[PDB]
Structure formats: structure tokens, C-alpha cells
Design a protein around this nucleic acid. Structure first.
Lengths: 749, 759
DNA sequence: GCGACGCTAGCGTGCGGCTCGTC
DNA sequence: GGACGAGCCGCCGCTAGCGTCG
């Protein structure tokens, strides 16, 4: 309700609450955080919301004709609370007091539009918009980076995969999608991301669905940033031009996220030193390449750093904790760079010369020494972006500012002398000089010396154990001091703005530097990983031949038994007992293929790999488990080509015996005919004898050693000759009698 | 070593910081809250911990010698802050000022008054309605397991033969804190197993035996008593120790409690307990939970519980009346304990009086036979002693009513007269001086005073003694006032004393009835449960179950699922039979299994059940292997083993697709051997499976049931009706086609099926 | 030949109570 | 000329620093 506040009493709202309600109504989609002193406050129903969400203590804001509930949080703890509130589904509108009893919204906090470094992860934070037309328009925006890109997908499936691959923090759905109760529930069940409203008026040229999705991002984000956004050129892209990595595949392979128990492929490759670099590597992983040319070039760069140890080590040492120049450039362009930002920037530009001396001219790094010297001359060594927005420009930089401060230092020195002269003249070694916004400059005497205070003194305020007096010659000195403090804050602000502007003019140079370094960062990190964990440079061809391949994530935890693999558009069945590494073997094959097509060396002794058009998996655990799996099998059968890598794990399970085998056979045959590279781990000895021309068998076995049965992870040629289902049951502690019947029945069958 | 506070600067440690550091080191695993005035403070790293843990401002305590970090919280909101600290995983050692500052040989006396740990909480605001158990596990002629609920005095334990049974006994109690015997802490392999299965806080306590009986139990009990007496800061209030036998009740393994979502949900969804519980009091919710934790095996007591339930189902007016009255009943059991332990607050006495005023009304409804204690005499003293709405602390406003205690009334009277004096003074001086706006005011810093504004400064009489100068006002003092002020202060100080003395005297009056309070609490808790189960029965349409050796359920339903969706009722007849249920998934086979266990669970708790009619046997335990070693196959085989070793002819066994996870033949073979053993065992077994092969075994007590899917206008429609006989067709391929498998692949699969099946 | 105390401002968690400026 | 922002003083107990007894 507009202008209405929840509480008791008649009378209109007092000034403070009126100002609050007015602001609160200009942003109905957000929780308004109103600054009141050292706190951010919410009133009425909003207080109750903040209180319950954060477990705060509800109080009251009372005036003569109205009393309303109240809850707030300390300014000092803002970021911490904002983060929780954002994660909790809240959208925040921040109203701060405008420097010299007047509040204004300074920030509009939304999960997908965050611009504060402190509330962001190193990785890209995307805002995504979806709209219809000829197919699906999908567009992404990273306000902190300016990254702006999109595409058009023909099927809902492809859309969902493109969406998932980017893990957006917030989604804007077109009106025809928000009204579609069918889509909405399907969408909310699959993507538990915050959904926000936005007008989908078209923008720019191209497919209408894209023009619209793009219109929504811009309109919504501009609102969040209170005006013009700082975006890089919108980039249209074709998912079809890269290796396909559906959601199911990304999850099963734990590329970016763990299924259960930490450690992902990305964490193992987590060796970059800079945020732009981590971002770039994530970008490459997200969309692996299909073209040999660019891949071979990337591999050369990595090989370069592997051979040039001193250089590699030199670069990595220098990039350590280097500031995110790309996001800094964005904060500058938007007129939001803080004094701290400029401090971080000058520090970064002091490292730049070192990187270039090491890297050389061909690298193309910009020379920003002029900017560096300016920041070195202008800023205090530790810019107090927060300490007051003052005490920022160092002495010596600006003459007008220096003169004012010097005038001020004398005023302060004056009162220091006034104090000494007075405690010598009065004999009160305790006599003090202090200032207060209310009484200004005064003299202070403790209770024990009240009878030594001269009569010239005019008492002005009495406290518990002391009293403050005044002296005729003190007034003019006070107001002059206050006059100077105002002039100083004002001048120092002007200088900061001028300094900040000079840094702003170099924004493109900053982005260019950030980009070149991000690449260097990635190549050097892939090289370090390769050298550190023993990775080799892959070679591309039609046949897949891997010697001593290992699962890159798993081997970092235990001693890994490497395995070989040779495939060429074949249906490879892997029989044998579970707990023998069959699953990890399928996954490691996929990870080596993914790494190679990203331009990284791989965990093997030798690896000849084809350039897959995609990796499709059916691995791991209202709709039953069987139907979920059949749905995944359906997508594989519909998307896999002769150039796809397909990984199936126990496909066919979860139903009756016969239907189960009939299904896996039909699926196996379809894949055998598709000419895809298929690794099918199964228990169906029956599939092992289909006799199709490109059908190949492999298996793992177990041996009842000292323990009673030890599963060997060595992948062996030919099909499994034995079944250990019963033996495992016997090992599980199932009654000997029951184990015996099973064997009897097993053989009897 | 330890005895040094973190902080920069050389020199010694200030006296206070010494008194602080001394106590701190005494409780290495607790966060010490050191009372200093109206704040509980922490120094050094501990101040750092506290500050970040609660997001407090981090200051410092400077002294010539050196300065150290400092963080603190006002005593006002102690419990609120502790609540937070507790939930973060901290243990708290509370050090208060034991000696009034008004008389201390320098440094105020400070000692640890109590420890706050998850399993020994006594504060109402830090406790859940449910029982809060401290548990202790030890060895010594079996596995000793003992529990203590310090807030109620519940004190019980038992000995178990295996580790499996120990763990299950522990789980059904969901302890908040566990004390492990030294040997178990020493046993590295045990500890890890324990930590993984039980994420609960582990604490240290000595395990010197206490009392008589099995060593293991005497040790666990000793641990509970040594630990709780320490935390409580004194002698505990305990109910007679109960050495019970879990074998005397229905067995409910952890796997079962979890699979049936009795107390905890699997997917955020409701719980049997959340649905069943409409209890009005905490003692009642606890009693109901206790009954669910250990369902009975005895027909007689069960029929008695059902009689009381049925009685409240019929007598609607009485049922709603009792529930209306109970709604306002405080927790008299926990109130009794606080009374006995000398912790009862003026707030507790208010709640006590309110409850005792309800007592006679309930007695009037249930009649003079429930055995409810007559406590009107205590009620009257409370009514005559405390103001209508009692304050939180005796130190402030009037806790005690006027006319109750003469000493106090004499004191208050003189205070009223002392205050009137100043009001009269303001009027006397306004006329004497002629300054109309003159005022007599007061503030804690200057005391009472005369106030005149700037326009009358040259009008102030010579007698006025300047006291406080303000911007445009000046305050003075007259000799007569100084005297009177000191008087008002003396009265105020005497009033706080006498009033606290009266509170304590009244509290002691209540404490003497602690036992009657517990007794009234037990009776009402039981009635709360019976009326509550009747309430649920009437609201959801449940019926009274009959006990026999045959299980005969007509139109039964899952009591929880039906709560959020239209449920299709189903029948079931079973008599020590192996019941196989074939058919596709998504047709309610699992729900059918679970509803069976829940109906049986509810009946053995003395509750009506969700069905049209239910004839039920008395099961000795419910064993499940539903949903959910390293391999999936191996894990399920382990569960099956436990089931085969504990299952009896009186057990209800629920198997969900046992045999999955391996090869064709091995799967069917294992499923068969398991089926035959359970058939031989004669337990009541419901076995949901896809194996048509199991439907034709040569077993005399094997019965077939199934669910079916229907290929209609939509594609495939699953029917939740449980049908007689085995499935006549498989729907795997159809479901696959429904999942989107391409037509030709589905077609090829059908062709393969018809060729295979065609031998 | 300086240890023992007397007296008393200063000081700071979170934040009540009190002041002051404005209208 | 009452009512409403807005911001400071002190709390309660301990201490350093003096100002002295003997």
C-alpha cells in the first residue's frame, strides 16, 4: 500500500518515516534499507521481514501520532548481511544519507547485477533473459565486467543446456513465458534461480527473440545501475560452433560443480592467478573448441610456458594477487571507482613494468606509467576509501589543498598553545582544550580544580566530573577552523575526482592489459598444472588412442591405476563388477577429451584424440529413476552423431529383466549404427555377444585375495567371464545359507 | 604454557585480566564469558572469536603494561546471544560476579556459575519443546547407553549386545550431545564411524562408575552425572533412574525411522510426527514422541490407550474444552525442575500461577478421579503475592503487590512521601522566587535539582548552589534537598532488598510443591495426548484398529502423503506371508509399503489409523530396505543382512527392489534366496519388485499383488490401485517410449522382447 | 627509602537518557 | 512552543597517576 505504513496510531507519518515510505514506494520489488545513523533500518512490515530473515530484535519507531515496528543492521556489517539477504532471495534498495536529514538510494542490489567486488566471486556473474519468437532468444550480461552476449536456440533442450552452462545468478523471463504455467513450473523445477520482471521491448538488430531478450537485460540492468551501463560490444554466438556439453554431462563429469564431496575438474585446473584469467579458463571449459587450428595454437602457448620455466615462474609470481583490472575499468567507466580502487590500481600499475620487462614487447601490453606516476604522486599509501572520503590526497600533490591544510594545522597548533599557556597560568596541569559540534572549542577542568579556575572563564557545560569553559579570544579561532575544514573536504573531493578522471581515460588500456594478462595467466597455469601433475600434449586424429590415461580429479586423492583405450567409431562394452573403477574409466575418458579441446595438456602418457562435437553421458543416480534415465538416453540418441563421445552406465536397469535387456540392446544397436564413440559399462553379459561389426569388449575383474575379494581397476580386453553379484552379497554379510542357495540357483539357472 | 593473554605491549597483566585468564584456562574447551559490570566480556583471541562470531565491535582494554583485544555483550540480552553462540557450535562457561560490588576486598569475586552446552541446557529460551538429551556410551560387559534430560530430570539407560543395536537406540533418541568412554575415543576406527553417522557434538567427561548394575551402564551413568553436575553448577534434579529393555518394545532401526520419515523428512516433506501431533503442551508433545520412539508390544495397555482416545473422539465438547484449557498450560515439568534447582524466575512464577488457575477448571471437566493435585493454596499465595503481569527482574518495577509484605509496604510508603517532597518543593520555590517556569528535575548524574532558564538567571536566590550548567538552563541545589535525596536513595536500596527477599520466600513456597507440579504435569501430559490423537482421528477420518494375528486393512492410506494430495486408498490382507508386488514404478508401490508400516506404527502407539477398517497383529519390529560398502548393490545387501539377522516371525519386513545393482542371473538368484529365507522366517513381508521370475516360486505362503499402467489417449496412465495376482505385462518399454525414446528404437525393443519371450 | 594504600578521573562492549537545534 | 531529528554522555569496575602516611 502506497504511503501506508504498518503500525498503530492516526496522525500522518513524521518527516523521517514519510521520507522512508516515499522511497520505499519507488522500488516495490526491493527491500528498502534506510540509513539512520550507524544503521540501515526497515519499518513496518519490512522491519518484520528483515527481523525474521536475519533473526533480529524487533523494536519500535515512535512519534506522537504513530508507532511502527523497526529492525536494522549496523553499516559496518552491511556487506555481510547484504550477502545473506541476497542469497536468501531478497533484492535490496540502499538509501544512504547524502552528506550535508536527506536520504537517497545509492545502490540497487540484485544477484545478477552486482557491481561490488566484495559481493562477487572471481567467476563471471551473469544476468540472463529468455524470450520467444523464431525459437529461443537467450542473452547474458555481466554488469561487473560489461560482458554482453547471446544466441538463438531452436529447441527447449538446447536452451536449457545453454542456460545451465552459464549458471546465471538471476533470470528474466519474457511475458509469454511467465504466463505459461507449464513452462514456469518446468523452469522453476530445473533452474532454482531468482526470476525477476522486466520489459522485453526489442533493442538493436537481428532475430526478434534476441532483440527482446537483449532489451530486457539492458532495461533491467540500467535500472539497477541508476542509468547508463558500461557494456562491451554485444557478441552473438553459435553453440553449434563449439563442443556440446549438456547439463547432464556437466553434472556427471563434475566439471564446475561437485556431485557430492568437493573437488571438481575446474578446482584441479584452478591455478590461475588473476580473476580475469580464472574467468577466461572457465570460458574455455564452458565451450570447448572443435577446430584444430586454434587448439594447436593454444597447445603451443602452453608448451611454450612448459619449456620456458624461468619465464613461467616469473609471470606467475608477478600475477599473484594482481587486481582485477577488467572490473576496475568497469567501476571507473561507471563513475563508481572508490579511493581504495585507485590505490589497488596504482599498485597494479607498479607491477605492469615488471611483467613487461619479463614478457617483452611482442606481448602488446600498454604503457601506463604516466597514470602510475600520477597515482603515486596524488594518493596516500593507504587510500581511506571508507575512513571519511577524506585524508585521501597526499601532502605535496595539490598546492591549494596544501595551503588550506597548513592553515588548518596552525589553527590546531594555536589551541594546543592556548592549552599549555592556560595550565601554566592556572596551575592546572589537567586543563584541556577540546571541541564539540554543539559548544565548539572549550577549556576543560576536572572537579578537583574548580576552585582554581579563573573568573575570566565562562562555564558553558557541566559534566559528571568536569566542566567546560570559554574564553573571549577563542570564538574567532574556532569558526576559522571550522571554515577551513569545510573548504578542505570540498577541495580534496575535487582533486580526487580529477585524479579519478585521469584513471578513467585509461579504461580501454586497462581492459586491454587485463585481457592480455588473462591469456598469459591461463597458458602459464595450464603449463604449471601439466608440469606439476605429469600431463602430456594431446594429438588429434580420427582414432582415439590413449596410453596410461588417468582421471585428473580422482588421482589427486589416491594412487590411480592408469588405463589404456583405443576407439574408432566403435561400441565398446565394459563388463565386470562395480567398485572396480568402470565408471571412473568412462569419466576419465571424457575429461581427457574435454581438456584437450580446451587446449590443455592431458593426464596420460600419450593421447591421440578426435575432435568430438560433444560429450553425452548417462552416468550416476514423481518421475522414477528408470524414466529419468530413459529421458537422458532419449536426448543422447537424438543429439549424438558419428563424431560424439557417448558414455552409458548400466543403461536398462530399473525395470523387468527382459524389458531391461531388450532396451539396452536396442540402444546399443542404435549407437553402433550411429558410428558414435560409445563406452557402455554394463552387467548385461548378453550385450557382449551381439556380434555387430564395430562392437568391442573390455572388462574389469576381482580376485578373492587375503581380504576375500579385491577389485582390480585394471581395464582388461575381452568380456567378463564371471559374475560377482553373489560373491559381493556373501561379502556383505548375507547369511551363509542364503549365499549358498543363490549360488545353487545361479548355477541351476 | 597457558596463562597468558594475547595482546601487544610488554609488562604484567592487570588484576582483572588475571582473574579472567585464571578462570579461562580452567575450561579449555569452552568460550568463557567474563562478567564485568553489565557486560560479559572476552579478551585476547577469545575477544576476537566473540567479535566475529556475533559480528560485534572489537575494542581493546589498555593498561600501562599493555593493551589487549576486547569484545563484550550486555547482560541484558545474554540468553539471546548465547542462543546464537550455541547454534554455531560453541560451549559456554559463564563467569559472573558472585560478590556484590558494594562490598569487595578490591577485585569483585568472579567464578564460573554454569556451563552452557547443547545437551545440558536449562534455560527455557534455549530449549526445544521436545526432550533434550545428553547421552553417554561406554563399554564393559556389553554396550552401555544412558540418557539424561537435565531440564526434566529424565534419567534412563540400557545395555545392548551389539554396536548395531547401540547405534539404533542412540538414533531413536536423537541426543543433542554425546559423551564417549575414553576407550571409544581411543579407538580411532570407532570414532570415525561414529562421527560420520552421528554429527552430534562430542564432549569429554570422566567415566568412573556410579551406582550398581552392569559396569558399562554404571560408567555411562557416571559420565552423565559428572558432566551435568558440572554444567548445572550444582546438585541435579533427577527422576528415578530407569534401566529399561528395548527388547520389550517394537524395534525401529534408524534405517526404518528414516525411510518412514517418522521424525525427520527425506525431501523437506512433512513428517509422521508433524501430522500426528496436535498436542497442546510440551510435556504432551514429549510424551507422544516417547510413545512413537518405542511402540508397545502389549495388547492390554494398547487397548487402554485406544479406550481413552475413543472416549475423546465421542465426547466432542469435553475434548475441545480440555484442549482449550490446555492451550494456556505452561510446562509444569520443566518449571518444577527449575524450582528444585533454585533457578525459577519471577516470570516462571507468573506462568505457574496462570497454570494453577487453569487446573481447577480442568479438574471440573475431567472430574475428581483423574487424580489431579489440588494446589489452590499455592495458587492463592501466588495470586496474593505477585502483580497481575510480573516484571522480568525483581531489581526493577514492583514484582510484589502492595499490601502483601508489611516491611516492603512500609518501605514503599516512605518512598512515595520522599518523592512527593520534591514535587512540593518545585511549587514552593516557584512562588518564593517568582519564576513561573522553575522546575525540580532529576538525572542519575546530578541527582535532584532546581532548574531555571536563562531569562531568570539574575532572578536566582543567593541560596541556590550551582550544580549543572547547560546551553540555556542552569541547575542548582538547596541544603534541604541533599538530605531528602539521600533518603529517597536509601529507601530505593532497601526496597530492592526486601522485594528480592519476598520473591525468594514466595519462590520457596512454590518449590515445596515441586512434586505435585510434576504429578499434575504427568497426568495432563497424558490427557493432552489422548485428546490430541482423538483430534487428529476426527479431523482426518481415522478408525480404531483391532488386534489379532491377521493383518486386514480395508481402504488404508499413507497418513502423510494423503495430507498434501488426493490419495487412492488400498486394501491388504497378510498372515505371515511373503507378498510380492509387481508392476511399474510411479504407481504407488513404495507408498503402499510405507503406509502399511505407518498404520501398524500408529496402532502400536495407541492411535487410530488411516483406513476404513484395520485388523492388525502386534509386530515386534518394522524393518525396511527402501530407496537410497561402496557399491549400491553392496550397500543394499548389507541392509538385507541386518534385516535377515534381526527379523522374526512377528516382524514386518518391507523390501523395495532387492536384487538390483548386479547381473541378470545374480540379481534374480539373490532376490530369490532372500525371498525364500523371509518366507521360511514367516515374517510379514511386502516385497516390491520387477522380477516376474519371483512371482512363480513354489512357496506355500507366497502371495502375488501388483499395480498396473494403462496405455490410453495420453500415452501411459499409472493406476495406484493395488490389484490381485501378478502383473500380466511389463511396462518398461512403454515407459521408455513415454520418456521420449525414438519410435524405431522402441519398436526394435518390442521386437527383441517378443523374440526373447518367444523362447 | 620507598613499599603501602587514598583518591579519582578515564574508559568502552551496546545503547538507554538526555540535550540541543529547528520550527 | 511542541514535537522531531540527531548525536553525545555514562553506565560499572578497574587503573594509572598522583598526592601522601611512616
Amino acid at each position: 500500500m502506497e504511503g501506508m505504513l504498518k503500525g498503530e496510531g492516526p496522525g500522518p507519518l513524521p518527516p523521517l518515516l514519510q521520507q522512508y515510505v516515499e522511497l520505499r514506494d519507488q522500488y516495490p520489488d526491493y527491500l528498502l534499507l534506510f540509513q539512520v545513523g550507524d544503521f540501515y533500518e526497515c519499518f513496518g512490515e519490512d522491519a518484520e521481514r528483515l527481523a525474521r530473515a536475519l533473526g533480529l530484535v524487533l523494536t519500535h519507531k515512535t512519534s506522537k501520532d504513530f508507532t511502527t515496528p523497526m529492525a536494522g543492521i549496523p553499516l559496518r556489517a552491511f556487506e555481510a548481511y547484504a550477502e545473506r539477504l541476497l542469497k536468501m532471495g531478497f533484492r535490496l534498495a540502499v538509501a544512504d544519507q547524502v552528506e550535508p536529514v536527506r536520504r537517497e538510494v545509492t545502490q540497487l542490489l540484485t544477484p545478477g547485477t552486482l557491481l561490488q567486488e566484495s559481493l562477487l566471486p572471481r567467476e563471471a556473474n551473469y544476468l540472463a533473459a529468455i524470450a520467444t519468437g523464431d525459437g529461443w532468444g537467450l542473452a547474458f550480461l555481466d554488469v561487473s565486467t560489461g560482458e554482453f552476449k547471446g544466441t538463438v536456440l531452436k529447441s527447449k533442450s538446447a536452451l536449457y543446456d545453454e542456460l545451465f552452462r552459464h549458471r546465471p545468478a538471476e533470470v528474466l523471463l519474457a511475458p509469454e513465458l511467465l504466463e505459461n504455467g507449464a513452462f514456469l513450473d518446468e523452469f522453476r523445477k530445473r533452474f532454482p534461480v531468482m526470476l525477476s520482471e522486466a520489459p522485453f521491448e526489442p533493442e538493436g538488430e537481428g532475430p526478434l527473440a534476441l532483440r527482446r531478450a537483449r532489451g530486457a537485460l539492458l532495461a533491467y540492468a540500467q535500472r539497477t545501475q541508476g542509468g547508463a551501463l558500461s557494456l562491451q560490444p554485444f557478441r552473438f554466438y553459435d553453440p553449434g560452433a563449439f563442443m556440446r556439453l549438456p547439463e547432464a554431462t556437466l553434472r556427471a563429469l563434475e566439471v564446475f560443480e561437485p556431485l557430492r564431496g568437493q573437488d571438481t575438474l575446474f578446482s584441479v585446473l584452478d591455478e590461475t592467478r588473476t580473476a580475469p584469467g580464472r574467468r577466461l579458463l572457465q570460458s574455455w571449459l564452458r565451450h570447448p573448441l572443435l577446430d584444430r587450428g586454434p587448439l594447436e595454437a593454444r597447445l603451443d602457448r602452453v608448451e611454450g610456458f612448459v619449456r620456458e620455466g624461468a619465464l613461467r615462474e616469473g609471470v606467475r609470481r608477478l600475477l599473484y594477487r594482481l587486481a582485477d583490472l577488467e572490473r576496475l575499468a568497469t567501476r571507473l567507466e561507471l563513475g563508481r571507482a572508490s579511493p581504495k580502487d585507485l590505490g589497488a590500481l596504482r599498485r597494479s600499475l607498479q607491477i605492469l613494468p615488471e611483467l613487461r620487462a619479463l614478457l617483452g614487447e611482442e606481448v602488446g601490453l600498454p604503457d601506463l606509467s604516466p597514470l602510475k606516476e600520477e597515482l603515486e604522486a596524488a594518493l596516500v599509501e593507504d587510500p581511506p576509501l571508507k575512513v571519511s572520503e577524506g585524508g585521501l590526497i597526499r601532502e605535496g600533490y595539490d598546492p591549494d589543498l596544501d595551503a588550506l591544510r597548513a592553515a588548518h594545522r596552525e589553527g590546531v597548533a594555536y589551541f594546543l598553545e592556548l592549552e599549555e599557556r592556560e595550565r601554566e597560568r592556572t596551575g592546572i596541569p589537567t586543563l584541556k582544550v577540546g571541541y564539540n559540534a554543539v559548544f565548539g572549542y572549550y577549556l576543560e577542568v576536572t572537579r578537583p580544580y574548580y576552585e582554581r579556575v579563573p573568573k575570566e572563564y565562562r562555564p558553558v557545560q557541566t559534566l559528571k566530573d568536569r566542566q567546560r569553559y570559554t574564553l573571549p579570544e577563542m570564538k574567532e579561532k574556532e569558526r576559522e577552523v571550522y571554515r577551513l575544514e569545510a573548504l578542505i573536504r570540498r577541495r580534496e573531493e575535487e582533486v580526487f575526482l580529477e585524479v579519478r578522471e585521469r584513471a578513467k581515460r585509461q579504461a580501454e588500456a586497462l581492459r586491454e592489459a587485463a585481457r592480455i594478462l588473462a591469456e598469459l595467466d591461463v597458458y602459464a597455469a595450464l603449463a604449471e598444472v601439466a608440469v606439476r601433475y605429469g600431463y602430456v600434449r594431446p594429438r588429434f586424429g580420427d582414432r582415439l588412442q590413449i596410453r596410461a590415461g588417468r582421471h585428473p580429479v580422482v588421482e589427486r586423492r589416491t594412487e590411480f591405476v592408469p588405463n589404456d583405450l583405443e576407439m574408432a567409431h566403435e561400441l565398446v562394452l565394459i563388463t565386470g563388477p562395480n567398485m572396480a573403477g568402470k565408471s571412473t574409466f568412462l569419466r576419465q575418458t571424457a575429461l581427457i577429451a574435454l581438456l584437450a579441446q580446451v587446449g590443455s595438456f592431458v593426464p596420460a602418457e600419450e593421447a591421440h584424440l578426435p575432435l568430438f562435437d560433444g560429450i553425452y553421458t548417462r552416468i550416476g543416480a514423481g518421475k522414477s529413476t528408470f524414466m529419468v534415465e530413459m529421458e537422458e538416453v532419449a536426448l543422447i540418441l537424438k543429439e549424438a552423431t558419428e563424431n560424439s563421445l557417448v558414455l552409458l552406465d548400466e543403461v536398462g536397469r530399473g525395470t523387468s529383466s527382459l524389458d531391461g535387456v531388450a532396451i539396452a540392446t536396442a540402444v546399443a544397436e542404435a549407437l553402433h549404427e550411429r558410428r558414435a564413440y560409445t563406452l557402455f559399462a554394463t552387467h548385461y553379459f548378453e550385450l557382449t555377444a551381439l556380434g555387430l561389426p564395430r562392437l568391442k569388449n573390455l572388462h574389469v575383474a576381482a580376485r578373492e585375495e587375503a581380504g576375500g575379494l579385491v577389485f582390480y581397476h585394471q581395464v582388461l580386453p575381452g568380456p567378463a567371464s564371471k559374475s560377482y553379484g553373489v560373491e559381493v552379497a556373501a561379502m556383505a554379510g548375507l547369511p551363509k545359507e542364503v549365499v549358498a542357495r543363490a549360488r545353487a540357483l545361479l548355477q541351476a539357472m
